[PDB]
């Protein structure tokens, strides 16, 4: 039970306005045949065009919402909309394109999908709210067959070319005209009452309905993301490495250790309240401070209300010492905080668009993150870059240009000249810091934080 059986029933009620007379009793096998595709009894890695909700979740990076609206059915122009915001008009002869024949539309579909997906996934999963026209339009741009590899590399083939009779992955498909072995899922099979807009609007106010196909495609994928990553959360699902995951996560751990260590040295807090992940370890194990942990899993719907996290009767006094909120997203941080908050607006291959302004951050695991909000940081200030170190000035064991920096807080810099070891460590730390910032993480601190207080920690 890993793939979706072609003999599973498909509820057809949502299809009967575009396809009147459609049988109520329908399997995926009969639906695929009706869509103009022939599976030929093939045991070659592609058992069904449609996939399970569990397979869709493992391949969330491949999700592309897709909707087709009858502009005027073999005789009428169709408006093809995608969750990329693209609308194409295909004539049978928010970007809006004029009507063109299928032979040129299919070229655009392949280019659009390849550019969107080459750095995200080895496939495409068309996410539908199936009414009929989208299913019957697939024969005009989709070819199916056995699982194949790219002509130019070892990746699985996602595109086909009728000009050269060859196959390509998303990276090598320039000039290709057919989508090859795509996957799809109909959200209407999950059990909903009412239309797409009424279900989407229950959870999201950011996607409006401009009455175009791409608006529906966007809403469909958003509703699917809400169902699979907001109301349902699965942290047992692992996702492959597609970018800087390892470096970003290592940088996050380095910056956390640096910032907390310096805050403890500068303001000598007697107690630290570490609010967040229940599997957390002390980021500064050698610190004197009374370290107290409070469990809160990453919120995936709305940011935690600080009143619920702290009140209703613990140290009780969160006002004592400092609070560390390392990726624990709250509505309004208290003034005595050290905060790392992911900015959902950041563009990257790890950060996918989400529900209600939120984003789906996929780095080893999938984390739906509530929308970034600047008002959460009103009691704090942005944490400035700095490098602090009390380690001995000693090289041990990469050429050198002397480092001059006001933010290298070391004994050598206090003494007037940065040593080679602390210059190498400063540059490595600055690289880790810039990686984490560009990855989308933002850092905030209590207003009284001042790196000038670190210089006297060397006596
Ligand atoms: C915004 C995602 N959250 C809540 C994290 O804690 C996280 C997840 C994966 C990687 C990293 N570095 C951080
Ligand atoms: Zn390739
Ligand atoms: Zn939405
Ligand atoms: Zn030094």
Please check whether residue 108 is in contact with residue 88, taking contact to mean a CB–CB distance below 8 angstroms.
yes
Asked whether residue 422 is marked as a ligand-binding residue, the answer is yes
Sign of CA dihedral 327, 330, 333, 336: negative
Instruction: Provide the annotated active-site residues.
Output: 67, 69, 134, 211, 216
Q: From CA 417, how far away is CA 410, in angstroms rounded?
A: 10
For the Cβ of 298 lying below 6 angstroms from any atom of ligand 1, the answer is yes
Name the 3-class secondary structure at 276.
Answer: strand
Structure-determination approach: X-ray
Q: From CA 376, how far away is CA 358, in angstroms rounded?
A: 15
- Ion ligand 3: residue ranges with CB closer than 5 A: 204, 207, 222
- DSSP code string of 117-161: HTTT-SS-EEEE---SHHHHHGGGTEE--S--B-SSSSSBP-EEE
Q: Rg of the Cα trace of the chain?
A: 27
For the Cβ of 83 lying below 6 angstroms from any atom of ligand 1, the answer is no
To test the pocket of ligand 1, the residue of 275, 342, 442 to mutate (highest count of ligand atoms within 8 Å of its CB) is: 342
> Quick one: which atom of ligand 1 is closest to the CA of 248?
12
> 82: which 2 tokens?
């995608």
Name the 3-class secondary structure at 107.
Answer: helix
Q: Which residues pair with 338 in a beta bridge?
A: 324, 445
Q: Which residues pair with 325 in a beta bridge?
A: 339
Please check whether residue 445 is in contact with residue 351, taking contact to mean a CB–CB distance below 8 angstroms.
no
> Quick one: which atom of ligand 1 is closest to the CA of 367?
2
In the structure, how many helices (H) and strands (E) does the chain have? 10, 22
> 373: which 2 tokens?
């909000």
For the Cβ of 124 lying below 6 angstroms from any atom of ligand 1, the answer is no
Reported resolution, Å: 1.9
> Quick one: which atom of ligand 1 is closest to the CA of 276?
6
- List of E strands, 154-270: 159-161, 166-168, 178-180, 183-186
Helix (H) or strand (E) holding 253: helix 245-267
What does DSSP say about strands 271-276 and 290-295: parallel, antiparallel, or unpaired? parallel
Label residue 398 exposed, middle or buried (CB < 10 Å: 0-12, 13-18, 19+). exposed
CA proximity to 50, closest of 159, 135, 120, 110:
135
Distance between alpha carbon 203 and the CA centroid of its chain, in Å? 18
Q: From CA 135, how far away is CA 128, in angstroms rounded?
A: 9
Q: From CA 79, how far away is CA 90, in angstroms rounded?
A: 6
Nearest CA to ligand 1 atom 1: 342
For the Cβ of 303 lying below 6 angstroms from any atom of ligand 1, the answer is no
Gap from CA of 34 to ligand 1 centroid (Å): 44
> 124: which 2 tokens?
């495409």
Task: Give the single-character DSSP code of 454.
Answer: G
φ, ψ dihedrals at 241, nearest 5°: -80, 120
Q: From CA 43, how far away is CA 51, in angstroms rounded?
A: 16
Find the ligand nearest to 416 CA.
4
- Ion ligand 2: residue ranges with CB closer than 5 A: 150, 152-153, 155, 169, 171-172
Give residues with Cβ within 8 angstroms of 156, minimum separation 6.
Answer: 122, 123, 147, 148, 149, 150, 169, 181
> Quick one: which atom of ligand 1 is closest to the CA of 342?
1
For the Cβ of 372 lying below 6 angstroms from any atom of ligand 1, the answer is no
Q: From CA 57, how far away is CA 226, in angstroms rounded?
A: 12
Residue with token string 């401070």: 289
Measured CA distances, 397 to 394, 408, 411, 420, 421 (Å) = 10, 22, 21, 11, 10
For the Cβ of 252 lying below 6 angstroms from any atom of ligand 1, the answer is yes
Gap from CA of 367 to ligand 1 centroid (Å): 7
Measured CA distances, 179 to 135, 187, 274 (Å) = 14, 21, 49
Gap from CA of 368 to ligand 1 centroid (Å): 10
Sign of CA dihedral 289, 295, 301, 307: negative
Q: From CA 203, how far away is CA 79, in angstroms rounded?
A: 26
Gap from CA of 105 to ligand 1 centroid (Å): 39
Gap from CA of 340 to ligand 3 centroid (Å): 26
Gap from CA of 66 to ligand 2 centroid (Å): 25
């Amino acid at each position: 039970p890993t793939h979706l059986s072609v003999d599973t029933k498909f509820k057809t009620e949502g299809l009967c306005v575009d396809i009147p007379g459609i049988p109520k009793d329908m399997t995926y096998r009969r639906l695929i045949s009706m869509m103009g595709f022939k599976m030929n009894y093939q045991v070659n890695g592609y058992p069904n065009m449609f996939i399970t909700r569990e397979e869709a979740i493992r391949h969330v990076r491949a999700w592309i919402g897709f909707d087709v609206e009858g502009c005027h059915g073999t005789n009428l122009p169709l408006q093809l909309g995608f969750s990329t915001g693209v609308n194409l008009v295909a004539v049978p002869t928010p970007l809006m394109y004029k009507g063109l024949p299928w032979n040129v539309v299919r070229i655009k579909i392949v280019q659009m999908l390849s550019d969107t997906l080459k750095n995200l996934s080895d496939r495409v999963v068309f996410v539908l709210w199936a009414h009929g026209f989208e299913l019957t339009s697939m024969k005009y741009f989709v070819k199916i067959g056995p699982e194949r590899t790219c002509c130019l590399c070892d990746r699985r083939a996602t595109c086909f070319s009728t000009a050269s009779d060859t196959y390509a992955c998303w990276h090598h498909s320039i000039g290709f005209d057919y989508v090859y072995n795509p996957f799809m899922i109909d959200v209407q099979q999950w059990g909903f009452t009412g239309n797409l807009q009424s279900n989407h609007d229950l959870y999201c106010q950011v996607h409006g309905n401009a009455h175009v196909a791409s608006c529906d495609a966007i809403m469909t994928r958003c509703l699917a993301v809400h169902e699979c990553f907001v109301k349902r959360v699965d942290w047992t699902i692992e996702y492959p490495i597609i970018g800087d995951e390892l470096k970003i996560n290592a940088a996050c751990r380095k910056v956390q250790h640096m910032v907390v260590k310096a805050a403890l040295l500068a303001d000598k807090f007697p107690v630290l309240h570490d609010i967040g992940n229940p599997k957390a370890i002390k980021c500064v194990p050698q610190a004197d401070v009374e370290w107290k942990f409070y469990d809160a899993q990453p919120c995936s719907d709305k940011a935690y209300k600080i009143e619920e996290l702290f009140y209703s009767y613990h140290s009780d006094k969160f006002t004592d010492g400092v609070c560390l909120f390392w990726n624990c997203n709250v509505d309004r941080y208290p003034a005595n905080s050290i905060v790392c908050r992911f900015d959902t607006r950041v563009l990257s291959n790890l950060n996918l668009p989400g529900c209600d302004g939120g984003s789906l951050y996929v780095n080893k695991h999938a984390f739906h993150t509530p929308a970034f909000d600047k008002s959460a940081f009103v009691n704090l200030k942005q944490l400035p870059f700095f490098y602090y170190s009390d380690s001995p000035c000693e090289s041990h064991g990469i050429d050198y240009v002397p480092l001059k920096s006001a933010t290298c807080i070391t004994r050598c810099n206090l003494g007037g000249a940065v040593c080679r070891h602390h210059a190498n460590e400063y540059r490595l730390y600055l690289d880790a810091y810039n990686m984490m910032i560009s990855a989308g993480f933002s850092l905030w601190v209590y207003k009284q934080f001042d790196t000038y207080n670190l210089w006297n920690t060397f006596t």
